[model samples]
Target: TLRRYRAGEPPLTGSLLIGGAGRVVEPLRAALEKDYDLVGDSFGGLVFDATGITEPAGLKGLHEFFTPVLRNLGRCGRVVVVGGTPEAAASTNERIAQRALEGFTRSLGKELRRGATTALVYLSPDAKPAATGLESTMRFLLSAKSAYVDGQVFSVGADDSTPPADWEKPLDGKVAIVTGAARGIGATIAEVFARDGAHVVAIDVESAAENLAETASKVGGTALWLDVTADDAVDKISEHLRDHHGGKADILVNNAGITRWDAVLAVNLLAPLRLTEGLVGNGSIGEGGRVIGLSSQTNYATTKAGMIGITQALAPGLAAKGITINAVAPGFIEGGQPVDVAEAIAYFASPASNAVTGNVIRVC
Candidate 1:
């Protein structure tokens, strides 16, 4: 669905904007209208503003709008609900109202078909339309770019952001570093990042040097054969980035993973703790873009592998540096064709997701 989008074309065939008619809705409507045509006759994108709904009763609006239009949603459509962050709520009732949106949006994911997706966005109180940073987020959720990102909840912050000079090339002139870029999802990420106008530095282990060079050359980038879990890996990458691309990388994708042993990503999420931590001797965090690892796996074990805790435990430190970490859990897709997962990774790497962190996204 995303591949069909071309330059100079509107992202959606048609959309339905549901919200009050005031300062809040007017600007949001205007923002969306800039890229998508809004009409009641058909529905390709259903965007709702649940931000002002302070009570549970207001949720009826969700039913009123979606119930009548579910059948009309076009193939590969999108459903995005914008609500307030529960922690930002002024009262318990308001917080309750905000949290309830998660369940509704998640459940909605089960009711849709034809490759459609539903997501919930918790907007910050200070967020302004086209400014305080909802523009790129809406663009991501409303377009085919987020096709594989389903049933997820994103909390948009009020931090000041700059919309890319070219929406089609958000990472223009930026440098991105991707690990495990020999093949599969990692190589695809290198391609997509380059497609978005980023200069990619592809990395992989020594054994896959040939494939790594091919992936890098395919994207017009450089390739380095270095084991990420090896000793002094951090210093080596830092020196490489400083000497070659620049002093810093605008994006970092920890795509290195192993499936022959422990189911791939679940272990990649645990790699920093089990391998890198012991190898490097210091729990070193990355700078800029995303240092994506695990979160809060302490005492919060689910079965024997709540490795999600690695990020949970390090989130405060990561957030303090303005860096984010997330995991993309993908089902066994066709070999050598993990484009769906790559698209999801691209979203995380883009500035559009500055507010999205410490979460799990499924692309299957």
Candidate 2:
């Protein structure tokens, strides 16, 4: 009798509740029926209902509807609330209702701990009346693809599009070497690589040797002692990576430079160039490897700007050798005081960024 369902597949295992059913629910239901083991119903009741909808009231009602759903979310679950209004998401009435949903979903995600993520999808004025953006989101929601990608709000109309399938995880098993791993952004970048599933080699000077060891241990990585500006720095790092995490270095974050801020021609320019030159000479970096120099945005980008020039000049050459070289020009990121900001930067340094070589992602 249930021949429509896939053989050996479990019964409709996920729940999709489509509020505002007058015109939008049918096509969404059809899409879900084809792809998901979905139980589509009104937005309230039935455990996952597809009811509690009306015009003008809009998203306000949707939030009330999802209140209970938030409490009972399964581990690694998802909830997508779709709503629309006459104004292009900027209209007064639509804005109030739509804006309210942001708080609701964000709060719900906070309360529903464990790995569950919640999202609010606001359909643009042009996208209403048809389920244009539901396909991709429904796929992400019902499947495991969006496990940790949570509490996000996205707007989709005709302009929204999905990338071609077969887009693989770029940093899978990639090797990364992060300099200055003892503290500040250095440790952050190293932690970032490990989070993205990369094997990280964290390097620090002799002063930070012990601290770097602890950081590396926490990240399931290795720590080395080396002065970035010293002649033996690159040789030491390259050897460490080769012996430990294979011979190739897939990613390198040149974040271990000191600053005197005295004369541009003196310590800043001279010392940094020495550090970079040594790394280039040693085979610490491999062909097709990524080199990221961390520069500052001071001097109106003049002194550090020289490093940017070096990055661009070396990028194509490295690319030819199957490698990439780039620079990250950052503003003054507060150091030592706030633990929260440091934690956030650590998240950024992870291996999730791949197609982002030869580019500067500014953080301050």
Candidate 3:
């Protein structure tokens, strides 16, 4: 039995062979040929007398015949085995015939050295005969779309749902600043930015000064010392920028904060209040800048709630200058410092975060 496809039929790139001519080959060949006739199709190629045997033994000399195919397995892109009982077959034992073919196909896959995939298709005794969704599955398996998938079996059924469209560049060349940068949560934010190819500025207190310097050097950024509570904090930051980098701050990460964790009245809410005032003051932070305040989850319950107050107060006023102030209240951010914070701080300082100002983004 010979099968040919329609003129406009989609071409199958894989080759097919009916191993045993006595019982299985005749019916399979007939069904395939009939289907091809209905669809006006022809195979890419076919094996005429491939009886899986050349010697006296009933079975083909599997080793001799497959040696060449196995040797140049690299040339064989994707191979598939199609076997099932067609309604046209003489016998009604679909499962028995198809099950036998599994051994032959699985053996063929094991013999191949280079990348190749194999699967078995089974049809019930009284099942309807139709190609159904087999064409799409075979197409995907043969193409690069299924490159990583191998040696797996899948059922074929109609898939009318659309797959996602192509993805264009997202968040390309955006700048983001992170403080507490010498370590801990701050470090994580900075590292995230650097991985995305954004410049980072790492900021820390004198405590992590050495580590901060090292982080800045490695991530292609700079380190700056900050004591948020200090009265001259804003002035000092302004002068340093003027002397070193031209007075430009695209992202301002207010991560250099200290926590007393004491009662708001006595433990000194004064310090945080002062720091917040200084940052929003004239010449402290710049216009069109994103001021990201590092806040603890405790800020939600504290009587002082300095972190929340600072965000609410600064954000409204800063809105006029295209500057946005927001707070990041990290939950369980691994409390102590890590080296990455310095790297993150540098990223926030870089020019990449120009468009993003005014929202607090959180990370666990």
- Best TM-score among the predictions, by candidate number: 1
In Å, residue 215's CA in model 3 sits off its true spot by 1.5
**lDDT of prediction 1:** 0.68
Q: Which stretches of candidate 2 lie over 4 Å from their true place?
A: 1-170, 257-283, 297-301, 335-358
User: Order the candidates by TM-score, highest first — what do you get?
Assistant: 1, 2, 3
lDDT of each: 0.68, 0.52, 0.44
Encode model 3's per-residue lDDT on 17-60: one tens digit a residue. Answer: 33333222354455345223212122232222122222234234
Clashes of 3: 31
Against the hidden true structure, what lDDT does model 2 obtain? 0.52
Alpha-carbon TM-score of each model against the true structure: 0.84, 0.47, 0.41
Alpha carbon lDDT at 17, candidate 3: 38
Better of 2 and 3 by TM-score: 2
Q: Local error of candidate 2 at 58, Å?
A: 34
lDDT of 1 by residue, 1-364 (tens): 3333456666765665555322245666766665677753567788877777888877787887688788888778888888877998878888988899898999987788668889887777766654346666778777767766778777666665666787788778777778778887778788888888999888888889688889989999988788776666667776777788655676766665331334343335444444323322332324446644322233323412444565456556566666666666666465213766776676666665666666666665
RMSD of each: 4.4, 11.8, 21.2
